[PDB]
Amino acid sequence: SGMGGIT
Amino acid sequence: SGMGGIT
Amino acid sequence: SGMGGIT
Amino acid sequence: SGMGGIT
Amino acid sequence: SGMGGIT
Amino acid sequence: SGMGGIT
Amino acid sequence: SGMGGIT
Amino acid sequence: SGMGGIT
Amino acid sequence: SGMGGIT
Amino acid sequence: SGMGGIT
Amino acid sequence: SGMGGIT
Amino acid sequence: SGMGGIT
């Protein structure tokens, strides 16, 4: 599992 | 603005 | 399970 | 404005 | 189960 | 199961 | 505007 | 399972 | 703008 | 599994 | 602006 | 702008 994003 | 998450 | 969004 | 959730 | 929305 | 949307 | 989800 | 979107 | 996800 | 995107 | 994550 | 990911 993990986390991430785009901005 | 942005999009993201944590699994 | 997790959480996320778009703004 | 936005959309999101927690499962 | 969980929660979420759109605004 | 899950959740989602379009706006 | 956007579309997305969590499964 | 996971999450994703388009904006 | 963008598109992305986490599996 | 993993994560990725295009912006 | 940017995109990134942690697995 | 860019595209990328983590497997």
Residue numbers in the entry:
A (entry chain B), B (entry chain A), C (entry chain B), D (entry chain A), E (entry chain B), F (entry chain B), ...: 58 to 64
Question: Can you list sentences taken from the study reporting this PDB entry?
Answer:
Although other intermediate filament proteins have been demonstrated to form amyloids, KRT8 specifically has not previously been characterized as an amyloid-forming protein. This protein, like other alpha-keratin proteins, contains a central coiled-coil domain that is flanked by an amino-terminal head domain and a carboxy-terminal tail domain, which are both low complexity in sequence composition. KRT8 is known to aggregate pathologically, primarily in the form of MDBs in liver disease. Atomic structures of KRT8 LARKS reveal that pathogenic mutations convert the non-pleated wild-type protein into a pleated conformation, shedding light on the molecular mechanisms underlying aggregation-promoting mutations in low-complexity proteins.
To assess the structural impacts of the disease-associated mutations, we determined the atomic structures of several LARKS from KRT8 for both the wild-type and mutant sequences. Segment crystal structures of KRT858–64 (wild type: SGMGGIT; G62C: SGMGCIT) for the wild-type protein and KRT8-G62C were determined. The wild-type fibril contains an anti-parallel beta-sheet, with PEG and ethanol molecules bound along the fibril axis. The central glycine residues (Gly61 and Gly62) adopt a nearly linear beta-strand conformation. Alignment of the beta-strands from both structures highlights that the G62C mutation results in the non-pleated Gly62 converting to a pleated conformation as Cys62 (shown in inset). e, Comparison of the KRT852-58-G55A GGYAGAS segment with a structure from hnRNPA1 whose sequences closely match the corresponding KRT8 wild-type (hnRNPA1: GGGYGGS versus KRT8: GGYGGAS) shows a similar trend in transitioning from an extended beta-sheet in the wild type to a pleated conformation in the mutant. An overlay of both wild-type–mutant structure pairs highlights that mutations from wild-type glycines facilitate a transition in the backbone from a non-ideal, highly extended conformation to a pleated one. Suggesting an effect of alcohol on KRT8 aggregation, two of three of our crystal structures of KRT8 segments showed the peptides in complex with either ethanol or isopropanol, each with distinct binding sites. The wild-type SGMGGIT structure (a) shows two ethanol molecules (gray) per asymmetric unit coordinated to the N terminus of the peptide, while mutant SGMGCIT (b) displays isopropanol binding alongside the middle of the peptide along the fibril axis, occupying the space between the beta-sheets (in gray) in the steric zipper. Both structures illustrate that alcohols can directly associate with KRT8 amyloid fibrils.
